Design a protein around this ligand. Structure first.
Ligand SMILES: CCCCCCCCCCCCCCCC(=O)SCCNC(=O)CCNC(=O)[C@H](O)C(C)(C)COP(=O)(O)OP(=O)(O)OC[C@H]1O[C@@H](n2cnc3c(N)ncnc32)[C@H](O)[C@@H]1OP(=O)(O)O
Ligand SMILES: CCCCCCCCCCCCCCCC(=O)SCCNC(=O)CCNC(=O)[C@H](O)C(C)(C)COP(=O)(O)OP(=O)(O)OC[C@H]1O[C@@H](n2cnc3c(N)ncnc32)[C@H](O)[C@@H]1OP(=O)(O)O
Ligand SMILES: Cc1cc2nc3c(=O)[nH]c(=O)nc-3n(C[C@H](O)[C@H](O)[C@H](O)COP(=O)(O)OP(=O)(O)OC[C@H]3O[C@@H](n4cnc5c(N)ncnc54)[C@H](O)[C@@H]3O)c2cc1C
Ligand SMILES: Cc1cc2nc3c(=O)[nH]c(=O)nc-3n(C[C@H](O)[C@H](O)[C@H](O)COP(=O)(O)OP(=O)(O)OC[C@H]3O[C@@H](n4cnc5c(N)ncnc54)[C@H](O)[C@@H]3O)c2cc1C
Lengths: 609, 608
């Protein structure tokens, strides 16, 4: 079959046996979707992903898009367009879209489980297919008349983009200089040059593209708060029917050459520079740009983390399948005997260590994103966790930088282990792992770098939140530790240490912040430790959710599981125990390092580096 | 300028101010090469590397070699061939080569500092240039007659390969099935298919190629001990004059498509399968192949480690230059103020943390490989360390798996920080870091995977050695810790690290002994082997950086100014940073290794 190896079994385990998302299925907004239908849809998109979507994964990398600078368009390889059309023909660009836009209502946890398969098989395909999702965000934020346009865009399958970045404004979105000039009739003319814009042209995939552009109204103040958000279509259109009209003044003027994600056209986007106005409409007819655009950023950050996680999963399963069949060397118990039988490399300790490291992080990361998604519907958060909608919203916001920052860094790092398992053959393009690595390196960068994720996590999702979301999650970990049954005692002990280590880091970083009121340079220590802190919280959450999974697996085994199910559950116990014993203790040293941070490295002269 | 950013200053700092290799220069075997000449040599090859060698780094990746099945040859991009001709025209392919083969005698520590520049600028260029070195190894192992051919090869500048691997024989070289059939005239016909052979064809770079090939004589025993080594030239030649004659039956049959290191042609090599025999000559007219071939493997392991270290160094210096000029955001003390002046990103804590991490590992890794090289000459090891030849050889053997395994893994991991510093632009081919990462991934694989390095390090370099080389090195660390305030906290952290590593070694040794009674206990050694190798690497890094800081302090107190002063200040900051941020993790690693169990070994394969 193809490069892409699905894990629907693990999705169903999380969704149904661990988190109990089927509790909300068959009722209320999910009236017409029941559990078994949910399982059928997971199986269907996984087969679709393993077949027609994965089919063009290599082709898109080896035959990347070609730019015509005179027409300002891109030509995509035909195999990839065939995969996109299979995605459209199944309606999968409409998963989780509201019913009034032609969607199938469903909890976000199931939506992201479905999308994982597209992201593991050919992640740029989901990126090109984000149009309908962006249309819903435009609908929610729009005027009544804009809601009509959003409905047309969703129904007609328009593409979409999020246009923030400029050469001088990447992490610092608020330095953007793209300008908006108000017209008497209430439209605006957008003038400037954006860069790194994903999908800014997409060949003939779509009838139109909705660019959602951040720009600064003439005379507005500085920073992100002076930015407004504009609906800037590639083509003007009939506002009543959707019929495409004159080309609007927004043109791709370069396409980047990238390490990976090559089939995803990443564009310099010129507005108002070619003698034709880039007409924009103010989104919701209010100046509230950074807030509106963050509705999109939140989904892109979830998507990017889930992509990284999906990629590690298929990288692990490729490595595992290879290790099961590769014969090399004798068992270590016979390494002195040069006539001993040769064994498959799964017999070797370092290979088993490597594979379990991959497995535990891949499955811990899947649990994290599905756990995060459990707080993205108030009904689900109430049904499975018993929390109100306000706390649910704060917990989801807390977890998003973990999913994005921890997921992206972890997935890339452990794909090193997946590739190593293949030996020399891992370095070949014949196997998919080297492309997984290249495709996933970007996940620590776009949608906000890891350092940006770490600062958001600490400054906004803990300090500004007054630690409510964090205290909730820490309390749920504590309950698991307290409610002994004794077969997970050492794991609970190790978790208790890791929770205390992370509580220490949070208190230390908060202390450096509080001490900055009298010595401003103390705040630098927050920066110095923020990413290590973010990564420690992800390890703690991975450890906890793996341990919860192990507890459910213990129940299912005690009850009499057999066959493939038994092996599945046995692997869950092994992963949780392995993770508790080999990853969690490192947090103690990370606590001590963070408790002792000094500003020596901030005081060093730049010339000394 | 080129992508390649060199660091001759750190090299000379290591060679002359820290280790004192200038003690041996200008006398004896090094009679005619003084310290000024050595420094001019480093600067010249650094210029070459930044100039014509680096010129074709991108070209070799974007326009890679092509296999021609019509001729069973590989075609190389013209720009890379011009880089190769610049290397040859300067004689750099004969550095550290024996004087009698046309080389310039020098200590290995200077040889590897020189080679570092080629490996940073375009590492495949050094790989194609291994011919003369391999010729000297053939000379040292050869019969009287074979020494004449080796001299011809070195002098005509033939290329060379090391031919071991087969599809079923990679880490387990002893499983190789390629066979050798003795002929009435004493030559051998070699019959087999080898895989992943570096440089197995090289277009028109060379007049001939010497393949050094491991193969099993008919009737020989199993395993590596049953293997012999054969000189198998691409063309037959006159054994007296070097005149090239008829084609020998050794053909490239494919070129692999790789993640990186693309301009290095990696080929399936077919011996005796295209209708004419692959005639080989038994090296030394002795059956001793794996021991002879390890003369080559040792140099390849040193080379791979140094390559990875070199690539991290130019990766770091690229990220540093970018960060000094990239303006983004306000200083963190002004983060609330949307009016505040924007700053270059070297003002941001996470960027400074990132850059210092890259710096401390790059310079600690350089110090490690140069330190290792000081044990590769008996004269140097005596002069700078006061060790005799037997212990120097064992210490070198101990450190090789560290240079290779720890160097390769560490360089690739930390290049992630280098790319991160560039932001979104790091993901672009317009900057070199993305190729550095791709070209660097293989360094954990060829010349023996990291797990092979870790097993060699523990079983062969410690246990078989009765821990003598290791106790020697631990004793040097302890001397530094005990000897003579500005480095008190660093020495305290080093003392904890040394005890951590000692505990790791004792725990693993215990697991190995228990295997006399419970054979499965040996699995626990395998489970902890790589983490133990990496921890020793971190300990050596911290110790050598701290030594560097101690020297830096002396030079500052003696009045260093200007650029020198900034350089020395950075050494003190890197040593302090490394000790406080990397070394403490070893304590948690010791505790994990102390409680390893076999649960993961007993798990059913179907549970994964
Ligand atoms: C399921 C449907 C899928 C949708 C379609 C997706 C597919 C698209 C295909 C391609 C996507 C590829 C991946 C994304 C592509 C990109 O990379 S787009 C560019 C990404 N850019 C960033 O992520 C910015 C990075 N920088 C920062 O985040 C930085 O921290 C910012 C810029 C926020 C700092 O500026 P400040 O001005 O200092 O911000 P401040 O803290 O003061 O807050 C101002 C203002 O912003 C809102 N805000 C800030 N942070 C958040 C968060 N985490 N969440 C929501 N809202 C946030 C607030 O309105 C805040 O105002 P307050 O008064 O509330 O403080
Ligand atoms: C200045 C010159 C520049 C470089 C030269 C030109 C380069 C041009 C080409 C560029 C090369 C690019 C990178 C290298 C290319 C490659 O990858 S080539 C293939 C590499 N293959 C390996 O490295 C093998 C990996 N596997 C092992 O090492 C494994 O551990 C082995 C195969 C050793 C296990 O087999 P065993 O049979 O079980 O080994 P054993 O321990 O029992 O010992 C047998 C025998 O081997 C010798 N030996 C073993 N280990 C060493 C070491 N570290 N050093 C020296 N010798 C060793 C011994 O002779 C031993 O016998 P004993 O009686 O002493 O035990
Ligand atoms: C670009 C490139 C260049 C090369 N150049 C050359 C060259 O010039 N000449 C040459 O002869 N060879 C060369 N090689 C071959 C190279 O040395 C091998 O690929 C390497 O030794 C690993 O062998 P393998 O690929 O068969 O992997 P395998 O040996 O099959 O290893 C697969 C996995 O199993 C693990 N493993 C294997 N055995 C054990 C064990 N006993 N204990 C624990 N884990 C184990 C490995 O560590 C790895 O994770 C090259 C390879 C490449 C990719
Ligand atoms: C493939 C790809 C696709 C993209 N698609 C889109 C898209 O569709 N739409 C869009 O709007 N943008 C897009 N981007 C832009 C991407 O979001 C930015 O590249 C990213 O935010 C980083 O900004 P930058 O590249 O300018 O790096 P910089 O902001 O210059 O960052 C450089 C380094 O400095 C660090 N840094 C910067 N500021 C701070 C700070 N205050 N504190 C600490 N560290 C800091 C960063 O962490 C990084 O290490 C894309 C980028 C890529 C690579």
């Amino acid at each position: 079959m193809s490069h892409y190896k699905s894990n629907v079994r693990d999705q169903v385990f999380n969704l149904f046996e661990v988190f109990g998302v089927d509790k909300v299925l068959g009722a209320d907004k999910f009236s017409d979707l029941d559990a078994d239908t949910a399982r059928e849809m997971l199986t269907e998109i996984a087969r679709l992903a393993e077949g027609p979507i994965a089919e063009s994964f290599v082709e898109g990398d080896r035959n990347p898009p070609v730019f015509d600078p005179e027409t300002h368009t891109v030509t995509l390889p035909e195999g990839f367009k065939k995969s996109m059309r299979a995605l459209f023909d199944g309606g999968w660009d409409k998963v989780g879209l509201a019913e009034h836009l032609g969607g199938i209502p469903m909890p976000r946890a199931l939506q992201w489980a479905l999308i994982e398969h597209i992201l593991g098989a050919n992640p740029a395909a989901y990126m090109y297919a984000g149009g309908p999702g962006m249309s819903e965000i435009f609908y929610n934020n729009g005027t009544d008349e804009q809601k009509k346009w959003a409905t047309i865009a969703a129904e007609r399958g328009w593409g979409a983009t999020m246009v923030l970045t400029e050469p001088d404004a990447g992490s610092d979105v608020g330095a953007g200089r793209t300008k908006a000039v108000q017209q008497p009739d209430g439209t605006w003319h957008i003038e400037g040059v954006k860069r790194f814009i994903t999908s800014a042209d997409s060949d003939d995939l779509f009838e139109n593209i909705m660019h959602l552009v951040l720009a600064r109204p003439e005379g507005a103040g500085p920073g992100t708060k002076g930015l407004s958000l504009f609906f800037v279509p590639k083509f003007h259109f009939d506002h009543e029917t959707g019929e495409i009209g004159e080309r609007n003044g927004v043109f791709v003027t370069n396409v980047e050459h990238k390490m990976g994600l090559k089939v995803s056209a990443t564009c310099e986007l010129s507005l108002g520079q070619h003698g034709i106005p880039a007409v924009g409409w103010l989104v919701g007819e209010v100046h509230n740009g950074i807030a509106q655009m963050f509705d999109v950023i939140e989904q892109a950050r979830m998507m990017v983390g889930t992509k990284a996680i999906a990629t590690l999963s298929t990288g692990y399963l490729n490595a595992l399948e290879y290790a099961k069949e590769r014969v090399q060397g004798a068992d270590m118990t016979q390494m002195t005997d040069k006539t001993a039988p040769r064994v498959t490399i799964t017999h070797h300790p370092d290979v088993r260590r490597s594979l379990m490291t991959q497995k535990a992080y891949a499955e811990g990361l899947r649990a994290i994103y599905l756990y995060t998604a459990t707080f993205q519907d108030a009904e689900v958060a109430q049904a499975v966790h018993g929390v109100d909608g306000d706390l649910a919203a704060r917990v989801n916001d807390l977890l998003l930088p973990i999913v994005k920052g921890f997921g992206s860094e972890t997935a890339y790092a452990k794909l090193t282990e997946s590739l190593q398992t293949l030996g020399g053959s891992g370095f070949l393009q014949d196997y998919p792992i080297e492309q997984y690595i290249r495709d996933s390196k970007i996940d620590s960068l776009y949608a906000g770098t890891t350092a940006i994720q770490a600062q958001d996590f600490f400054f906004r999702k803990i300090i500004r939140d007054k630690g409510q979301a964090l205290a909730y999650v820490a309390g749920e970990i504590e309950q698991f530790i307290k409610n002994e049954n004794g077969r997970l005692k050492t794991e609970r002990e190790l978790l208790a240490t890791a929770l205390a280590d992370v509580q220490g880091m949070a208190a230390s970083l908060t202390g450096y912040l509080m001490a900055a009121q009298e010595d401003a340079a103390s705040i630098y220590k927050v920066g110095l430790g923020s990413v290590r802190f973010l990564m420690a919280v992800g390890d703690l959450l991975s450890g906890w959710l793996l341990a919860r999974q192990a507890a459910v697996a213990i129940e299912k085994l005690d009850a009499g599981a057999t066959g493939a199910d038994k092996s599945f559950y046995e692997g869950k116990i092994a992963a949780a125990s392995f993770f508790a014993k080999n990853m969690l203790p490192l947090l103690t040293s990370t606590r001590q390092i963070i408790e002792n941070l000094d500003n020596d490295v901030m005081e060093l002269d730049e010339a000394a580096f």
